[PDB]
Design a protein around this ligand. Structure first.
Ligand SMILES: NC(=O)c1ccc[n+]([C@@H]2O[C@H](COP(=O)([O-])OP(=O)(O)OC[C@H]3O[C@@H](n4cnc5c(N)ncnc54)[C@H](O)[C@@H]3O)[C@@H](O)[C@H]2O)c1
Ligand SMILES: NC(=O)c1ccc[n+]([C@@H]2O[C@H](COP(=O)([O-])OP(=O)(O)OC[C@H]3O[C@@H](n4cnc5c(N)ncnc54)[C@H](O)[C@@H]3O)[C@@H](O)[C@H]2O)c1
Lengths: 319, 319
């Protein structure tokens, strides 16, 4: 029932997944296990989420019970910013593999086009914004392509099935395509009605790169973290445009928000943090939006970005 | 006196220059020669402008009459898109040097972070958008850093004093700084009240990169090319905000537009196509805009870009 997308790598990737950012450690394993019982097969994780061992526990439990086999589960993880230097890339992936308790991850992404100074795993893990000097940000001179080639070698070694990037703007993705032997299979970016970036989506799709949207509910994820920008932003769940379209199809605003991406061939990985949302968030493909619906939703695009490294340390990723 | 800006390379660059884009071949020499007599010392040219031989004639005449010496002139040129493959960078630079009739250029910029297929000079020069296959765009898989390293060797060879880039968004500039041995001394970008990109400016200046603005009068240069977007755009010369401020100081809108950039440490290279403009375009540093003036002008920033490769072939530089 959940459609698969064939990546440029030749592997299939479920079009609807389960988001693991801020999935609490104490309950992450139980939540992943229940997600698997509910039919989810892709888990969007990251070294920075600091809960890969627990995500690994939930998957292992489902496998041990015979609910699924490892090859039926799609695990995505992401290389954190302190690990871009080629000599530390495999080290970080090995930590991910050991925590997830698997021999390979299905998709491994460069989390951000930012290279923090390396911090040894024994000193702090996950390091977050820590760069080895108190609260100061410290960076290292590692071009993206050096990190990409280190990843390409790890695909040849069988430790990663498909590789991609997250939080890359068009000029950067284009330059990487010039040096890549294995083309990035996935571009994972913030994508919701207030930040539609239609030209980025069009370029990447035409290049054969698959888009995975994150924060499909816009400000909501950041409101939950007390972010001022998101708290100040009218919710998409109560926006008249979204509500009118939902009422027209007798669907919920959340279903409209997910379908809007899905219908355009964009993969989604919503955070389903309540049993009812688990079902709601994988059952929305029951109606089609029309060109007019897309034109009405297109009016919400105001280029409002909630996940921005400019907020961390004025890092110019999106300027 | 035109203040100088000290570049990260150690060389001084006039903060006010004479733009050579669209300077007609038949009169370019005389115009450059008159600009020199009027006090201009920096000439912003490019292979794509197709008039470097004539710009060279104007500079040579002035040197031959003893008005200036080579060392007092700052010549900027730019590497066009078809010449990014390393082996073609020196040949393209040599063509520029032979046309300008000099042994070195003071500043050489990568014109766009775009790599068109190489076209021999004898086949077509300047090639513009021609890529060797009728009207089709054809590209080369040459990462920006390879091109940059080729430029660095040319600085070592004494053929270029300072190197830089043009039309680079923040993420791409940041990645280049990670691989660059000689840091880009200049970032030249479209810059006017409708496209302020304050964060990009702030990031580059803090990184020690000097900004050169082009199209300081906004839609005007593109209106002069029958461009649809520009023709349908309220001119900055009649915009109420600019008008009010020019009136307040008994300045022309053009002088306000140039000082707005200059007062913020940004170099300007206005195309002065009339004798009176020639004088005014380098004599506008006689007043300071106030914090409120800046605040008022900041309200015009709508992100309207007139020079966008997306219009050429949906090239994702700015998305
Ligand atoms: N690569 C990146 O930089 C990056 C950044 C952020 C998120 N992501 C990924 O994408 C995932 C999803 O994004 P997100 O976590 O920011 O949040 P989201 O937008 O999926 O959900 C945000 C919130 O909305 C609520 N919600 C979910 N389903 C709902 C429903 N049916 N009805 C009403 N409210 C509902 C929940 O409170 C939830 O926490 C993450 O868990 C992570 O895996 C990646
Ligand atoms: N790197 C790049 O991609 C790039 C692109 C475009 C231009 N440039 C450079 O920057 C220069 C300046 O930019 P531009 O030529 O696009 O336009 P501009 O904004 O300097 O001037 C545009 C037009 O306004 C008029 N003008 C000039 N001075 C005036 C004055 N005092 N009062 C009233 N009108 C006046 C002229 O008709 C002129 O053609 C170019 O000549 C070129 O050297 C670089």
């Amino acid at each position: 029932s959940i459609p698969d997308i064939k990546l440029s790598s030749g592997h299939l990737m479920p079009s609807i997944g389960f988001g693991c950012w801020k999935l609490a450690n104490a309950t992450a394993g139980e939540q992943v296990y229940q997600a698997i019982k509910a039919g989810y097969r892709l888990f969007d994780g990251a070294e920075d989420y600091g809960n890969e061992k627990e995500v690994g526990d939930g998957v292992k439990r489902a496998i041990d019970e015979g609910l699924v086999k490892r090859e039926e589960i799609f695990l995505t993880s992401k290389l954190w910013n302190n690990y871009h230097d080629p000599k530390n890339v495999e080290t970080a992936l090995n930590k991910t593999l050991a925590d997830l308790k698997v021999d390979y991850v299905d998709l491994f992404l460069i989390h951000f086009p930012i290279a923090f100074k390396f911090v040894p795993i024994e000193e702090k893990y996950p390091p977050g914004f820590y760069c080895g000097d108190g609260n100061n940000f410290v960076y290292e001179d590692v071009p993206i392509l050096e990190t990409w080639k280190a990843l390409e070698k790890l695909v040849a070694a069988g430790k990663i099935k498909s590789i991609g990037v997250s939080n890359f703007p068009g000029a950067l993705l284009l330059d990487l395509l010039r040096g890549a032997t294995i083309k990035p299979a996935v571009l994972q970016v913030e994508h919701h009605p207030y930040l539609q970036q239609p030209k980025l989506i069009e370029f990447a799709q035409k290049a054969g790169v698959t888009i995975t949207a994150y924060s499909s509910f816009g400000p909501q994820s950041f409101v939950e973290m007390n972010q001022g920008r998101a708290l100040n932003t009218p919710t998409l769940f109560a926006h008249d445009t979204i509500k009118a379209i939902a009422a027209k199809y007798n669907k919920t605003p959340a279903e409209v928000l997910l379908r809007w991406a899905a219908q355009r061939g964009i993969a989604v990985i919503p955070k389903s943090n309540l049993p009812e949302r688990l079902v709601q968030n994988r059952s929305f493909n029951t109606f089609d939006l029309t060109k007019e619906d897309f034109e009405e939703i297109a009016k919400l695009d105001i280029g409002l970005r909630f996940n921005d490294p400019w907020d961390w340390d004025n890092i110019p990723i999106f300027v």
